[PDB]
Design an enzyme around this catalytic site. Structure first.
Site, short mmCIF file in Angstrom:
data_model
loop_
_atom_site.label_atom_id
_atom_site.label_comp_id
_atom_site.label_asym_id
_atom_site.label_seq_id
_atom_site.Cartn_x
_atom_site.Cartn_y
_atom_site.Cartn_z
N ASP A 99 -3.85 -9.77 7.71
CA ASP A 99 -4.27 -10.59 6.56
C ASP A 99 -3.25 -11.32 5.96
O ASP A 99 -3.05 -11.35 4.77
CB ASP A 99 -4.89 -9.59 5.40
CG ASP A 99 -5.59 -9.99 4.33
OD1 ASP A 99 -5.74 -11.40 4.49
OD2 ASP A 99 -6.05 -9.20 3.56
N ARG A 116 -2.19 -15.00 -1.05
CA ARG A 116 -2.49 -13.96 -2.26
C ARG A 116 -1.81 -12.85 -1.61
O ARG A 116 -1.66 -11.86 -2.71
CB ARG A 116 -3.95 -13.89 -1.99
CG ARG A 116 -4.52 -13.39 -0.72
CD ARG A 116 -6.01 -12.77 -0.78
NE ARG A 116 -6.67 -12.65 0.61
CZ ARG A 116 -6.96 -13.44 1.54
NH1 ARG A 116 -6.85 -15.05 1.02
NH2 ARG A 116 -7.28 -13.22 2.77
N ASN A 117 -1.27 -12.59 -0.33
CA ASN A 117 -0.80 -11.30 -0.16
C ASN A 117 0.93 -11.59 -0.06
O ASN A 117 1.71 -10.84 0.34
CB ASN A 117 -1.02 -10.97 1.23
CG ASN A 117 -2.04 -10.10 1.03
OD1 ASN A 117 -2.35 -9.07 0.19
ND2 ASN A 117 -3.02 -10.08 2.12
N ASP A 150 1.00 -6.50 1.36
CA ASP A 150 -0.57 -6.31 1.50
C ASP A 150 -0.95 -5.44 0.54
O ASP A 150 -0.60 -4.20 0.22
CB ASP A 150 -0.73 -5.46 2.85
CG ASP A 150 -2.04 -5.66 3.48
OD1 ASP A 150 -2.82 -6.63 3.35
OD2 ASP A 150 -2.55 -4.34 3.91
C1 LIG Z 1 3.12 -0.90 -4.17
C2 LIG Z 1 2.91 -1.28 -2.86
C3 LIG Z 1 2.38 -0.31 -1.95
C4 LIG Z 1 2.39 -0.79 -0.53
C5 LIG Z 1 2.53 -2.08 -0.26
N1 LIG Z 1 2.42 -2.48 0.96
C6 LIG Z 1 2.92 -3.58 1.84
O1 LIG Z 1 3.51 -4.36 1.20
C7 LIG Z 1 2.69 -3.49 3.05
C8 LIG Z 1 3.15 -4.47 4.07
C9 LIG Z 1 2.82 -4.52 5.07
C10 LIG Z 1 2.28 -3.66 5.80
C11 LIG Z 1 2.11 -3.45 7.40
N2 LIG Z 1 0.55 -3.24 7.72
C12 LIG Z 1 0.29 -2.92 8.94
C13 LIG Z 1 -1.14 -2.79 9.50
N3 LIG Z 1 -1.86 -3.70 8.87
C14 LIG Z 1 -3.16 -3.56 9.16
C15 LIG Z 1 -1.85 -3.83 7.58
C16 LIG Z 1 -0.47 -4.39 7.34
C17 LIG Z 1 1.72 -2.58 5.00
C18 LIG Z 1 1.83 -2.61 3.55
C19 LIG Z 1 2.90 -3.02 -1.36
C20 LIG Z 1 3.06 -2.54 -2.71
N4 LIG Z 1 3.51 -3.41 -3.54
C21 LIG Z 1 2.64 -4.32 -4.45
N5 LIG Z 1 1.21 -4.35 -4.26
C22 LIG Z 1 0.70 -5.09 -4.99
C23 LIG Z 1 1.04 -6.04 -5.92
C24 LIG Z 1 2.51 -5.92 -6.13
C25 LIG Z 1 3.26 -6.56 -7.08
C26 LIG Z 1 2.60 -7.29 -7.99
C27 LIG Z 1 3.30 -8.01 -9.01
C28 LIG Z 1 4.61 -7.74 -9.01
N6 LIG Z 1 5.34 -6.92 -8.07
C29 LIG Z 1 4.54 -6.34 -7.19
N7 LIG Z 1 3.25 -4.99 -5.47
#
Ligand SMILES: Cc1ccc(NC(=O)c2ccc(CN3CCN(C)CC3)cc2)cc1Nc1nccc(-c2cccnc2)n1
Length: 290
Positions: free
Chosen positions: A154, A158-159, A172
């Site tokens: 994804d 937006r991500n 994500d």
């Molecule tokens: C709080 C949190 C918890 C988990 C994540 N996750 C990730 O960032 C992430 C990135 C890559 C993967 C890898 N993954 C592998 C498999 N495929 C299918 C999906 C991706 C997984 C999670 C982000 C966040 N942070 C987050 N999320 C949304 C908004 C915000 C945010 C908004 C504004 C200011 N600061 C932060 N911050």
């Protein structure tokens, strides 16, 4: 997954003081908070905390744990949203990450565009070099994920989150995104998919690789150099759209993209996955431009 959770990330939930909501989906949300004594240096930090809503059930909880396990497995990099800690004992699962001051890249670009037009109609303005840095940084983050055999599925503006010094990080939203009411997610049978960002092999064969991420990154590149326009604007996702993408139809050059960068986009949109550039190739190219 079958990966283990290491309690080195374990943080006391009582050491968090919650603020406003940064984003909310059907069964999950992200909330801003302050952590007290977080990390090696016992820092007192503003952080982002992902958690399940009261509407969530067992499956949503297993997903949040998997996401946490994956983030541990990934390791840390400057251009991803880093895991800072977790709360898995004595209450709901809480996932704690870096807080990104400027929010998602898509909204940032749109608000920045409006602010630059302001003086004519209604901090400092963007320059071409800023767009190149953003693109370069996201590529570095994706190259890091690719080196870990990790498929994002994804990749989109937006991500992408912008933190201090305007550094782009790939993230994500997952459960914290309202896909059910998001018009960028199309109803394709069983699931709701970001079709305008997807590679043909993903759409038709349900195939996800590092290469299908590279395609989606190309769409992201388009988003950046159009300053946050919707991909294939005005075009309804239907049989004609599917057939068009499959036959090699590509978006036109964005208004702010140098021919150089648009050529990179086209390369990302090679119908043959192995013909697309690698994230390290994209990284090296963009770093030099920026
Ligand atoms: C709080 C949190 C918890 C988990 C994540 N996750 C990730 O960032 C992430 C990135 C890559 C993967 C890898 N993954 C592998 C498999 N495929 C299918 C999906 C991706 C997984 C999670 C982000 C966040 N942070 C987050 N999320 C949304 C908004 C915000 C945010 C908004 C504004 C200011 N600061 C932060 N911050």
């Amino acid at each position: 997954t079958q990966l283990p959770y290491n309690e080195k990330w374990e943080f006391p939930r009582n050491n968090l003081q919650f603020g406003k909501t940064l984003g909310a989906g059907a069964f999950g949300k992200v909330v801003e908070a302050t952590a007290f004594g977080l990390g090696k240096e016992d820092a007192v930090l503003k952080v982002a905390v992902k958690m399940l809503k009261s509407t969530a059930h067992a499956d949503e909880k297993e997903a949040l744990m998997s996401e946490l396990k994956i983030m541990s497995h990934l390791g840390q990099h400057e251009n991803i949203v880093n895991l800072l800690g977790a709360c898995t004992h004595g209450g709901p699962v809480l996932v704690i990450t870096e807080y990104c001051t400027y929010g998602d890249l898509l909204n940032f670009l749109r608000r920045k565009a409006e602010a630059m037009l302001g003086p004519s109609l209604s901090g400092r303005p963007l320059e071409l070099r800023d767009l190149l840095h953003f693109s370069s940084q996201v590529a570095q983050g994706m190259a890091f994920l690719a080196s870990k055999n990790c498929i994002h599925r994804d990749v989109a503006a937006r991500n992408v989150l912008l933190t201090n010094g305007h550094v782009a990080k790939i993230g994500d939203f997952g459960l914290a995104r309202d896909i059910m009411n998001d018009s960028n997610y199309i109803v394709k049978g069983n699931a709701r998919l970001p079709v305008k960002w997807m590679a043909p092999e993903s759409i038709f064969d349900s195939v996800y690789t590092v290469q299908s991420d590279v395609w989606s990154y190309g769409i992201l590149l388009w988003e950046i150099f159009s300053l946050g326009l919707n991909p294939y604007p005005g075009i309804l996702v239907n049989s004609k759209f599917y057939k068009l993408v499959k036959d090699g139809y590509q978006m036109a050059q964005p208004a702010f993209a140098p021919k150089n960068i648009y050529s990179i986009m086209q390369a990302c949109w090679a119908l043959e996955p192995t013909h697309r550039p690698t994230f390290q190739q994209i990284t090296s190219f963009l770093q030099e431009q920026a």
